Amino acid sequence: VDDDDKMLAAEAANRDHVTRCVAQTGGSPDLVAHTAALRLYLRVPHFLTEWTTDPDRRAAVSRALALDIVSMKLLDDLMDDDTGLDRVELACVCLRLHLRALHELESLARDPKAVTDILEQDAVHLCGGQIRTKRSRATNLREWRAHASTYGSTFLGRYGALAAACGGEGQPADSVREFAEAFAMTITMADDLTDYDRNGERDGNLAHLMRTGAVAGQDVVDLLEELRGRALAAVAAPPGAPGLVPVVHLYTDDVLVRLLPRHLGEAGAGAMATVKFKYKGEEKEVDISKIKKVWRVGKMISFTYDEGGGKTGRGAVSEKDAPKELLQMLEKQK
Amino acid sequence: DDDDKMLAAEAANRDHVTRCVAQTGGSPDLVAHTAALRLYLRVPHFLTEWTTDPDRRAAVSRALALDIVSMKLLDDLMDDDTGLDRVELACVCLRLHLRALHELESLARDPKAVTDILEQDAVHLCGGQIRTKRSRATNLREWRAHASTYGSTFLGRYGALAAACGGEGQPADSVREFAEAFAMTITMADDLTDYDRNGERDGNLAHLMRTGAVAGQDVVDLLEELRGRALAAVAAPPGAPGLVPVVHLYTDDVLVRLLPRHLG
Incomplete structure (x- = not known):
C-alpha cells in the first residue's frame, strides 16, 4: 500500500545503480541482466537500512550495500562456473562493484576505519566456513544449519553491521545484525527448497535431506519458527524497526505455506x-x-x-x- | 647491503601471505601456488623504496603484498587453468583482500585514501581487463594499449597506495610513474616467458613477434622508452636511486635474454 511502495522503489533504485555500474565497466548485456535478476538481494539492503532516519542517507547506504551483495554474489557464481556467463566479465565486474561499494560505504561511515573493520572481523570465519561448506555436503539439520549460519547468516550479518555503521544516528548496532543473521537463514531455507531447474541445478541440500527422511519436517518448522522469533525479537529492541515485522512474517510464512509442502506430503509436520x-x-x-x-x-x-x-x-x-x-x-x- | 634487503622483504612478504592463506583454509596446494608468485611478492619492495622508517616500510610492503597476491588469485579464478580448487581460490582471494584493505588502512595517513585510490580508476582497470581478453591484440600498438591497463594501471594503484601509506615526503606521482612503467616491462617479460605449464598458450606479444606482426626493433624501442620513463621517475626528488639497477636489471633481462628467443 505505502511502505510496500518504498521497498519497491528502493529495489528499483538499487537495481539501476547496480546495472548502470555493471554496464559502464564492460559487463556484456547478458551479465547486466543476470545482475538485475537478483531481486531478493537488491531488495534486502532496504530492510537493513530500516533504522535509518534520514531518507537520503538511507537511499545511499542501501545501494552501496546493494553493490557489494551483488559483487559478492558474482564472486560466487564465479566459483560455481555454472552460470554460462563469461568468467572474465564476472571476475572484473565483481571487483569493480566491490571497490565502488567500499568507496560509497566509507563516505557515509561513522569512523573512517569502521568499514574495513567489520569486513575483517569475521573474514576468516566467513571465507573458510564457505570453504568447508562445500568441502562436505551436510547430512542432517544440525549440519545444514551449521553451514547456513556462515555463508548465509554471517554473510548478511556483515551488511547488517555495515548498514548500522553507515546509517547515521540511532542504529541499534547489534540488533540490526541480529535481524540480518536471522532473516538471512529464513530466506536461505526458502532458497534451498526452491528449485528453478535451469542448467544442472541440484535439488536443495535441505530439500533433499528432507525428502530422504534424513531431516524431519517438524524440525524445519521449529527452526523456521525460531528464526521468526529471533527476528521479531531484534526488530523490537528500541528504537525499533516496526516496519520489518510484516516482512519477517511474510517470508517465514511463505516457506511454511508455499514451499515446505512441495517436499513433505499430505501430512506436513507433527x-x-x-x-x-x-x-x-x-x-x-x-x-x-x-x-x-x-x-x-x-x-x-x-x-x-x-x-x-x-x-x-x-x-x-x-x-x-x-x-x-x-x-x-x-x-x-x- | 641492498640486495640483502630485497631478499629479506620478499621472504617476509611471502610468509605474511602463506601464513594468511594457510589459516583461512587454503590447502597445501594453494599456499604453495601463492608463494611461487615471486616477482609479485618482491615488487612491493621496490614500491616502498621511497619509504623512510623501515618498520612502516615493511608493514606497507607486506600489506600491498596481500592484495597483489589476492588480485592475482582473482585472475587464476577467471582463467580456471591452474587446476586448483575454484572455491579455495575464491575464498582466499577475498580473505587476503579484506586483510590487505584493513592493513593498508591502518598504515595510511587518511584511511579514506585507500578506497579513493582503489575507486579512482577502478573502471579504467576493470573494463580494460575485459576488453583485453575480449579482443586479443594484433600489432604492438594494441598490445601496448591492453598492457597499459592490466599491467600499468594495475601496478600504478599499488604505487599510489604505497605513497599514501608510506608517510611523509613521498613523491606520489613519481612513485606511481615508476610503477606503471616498470609494470609494463615485467608484463612484456612475462608474455615472452613460456613455462610450458598445463595449456599455457605462447605469449601474445611473443606470438606477434614470431608471426612478424610486431617488429623486433619496435619492441626494442618500447623497452627502452620504458627504461627511461622509469629512471626518470626514480630521479625526481627526493629520488629513489636504489631502483636504478633494478630498472636496468629487468629491462636488460628482456633485451639480452628473452628477446632473442622470439626473433621469428
Missing part, C-alpha cells in the same frame, strides 16, 4: 491431528483423517467417524477440546 472424547464409558481418540461428518450444536461439535471397516462411530466434544483441524471441517460443510 503427529496426525486427533480428537479425544469420552464415549459410552470409554476413552476415544480419532484422527481427523477418519472423521467423516461433523457439525455444530450450540458450543459443542458433534461428529461421526470411520471406526473399523463399514463401522461408523460417533462423538461429541466441546468446541474447546476440539482440534483446529476439526473446526475447519465444519467450514467445508456448512
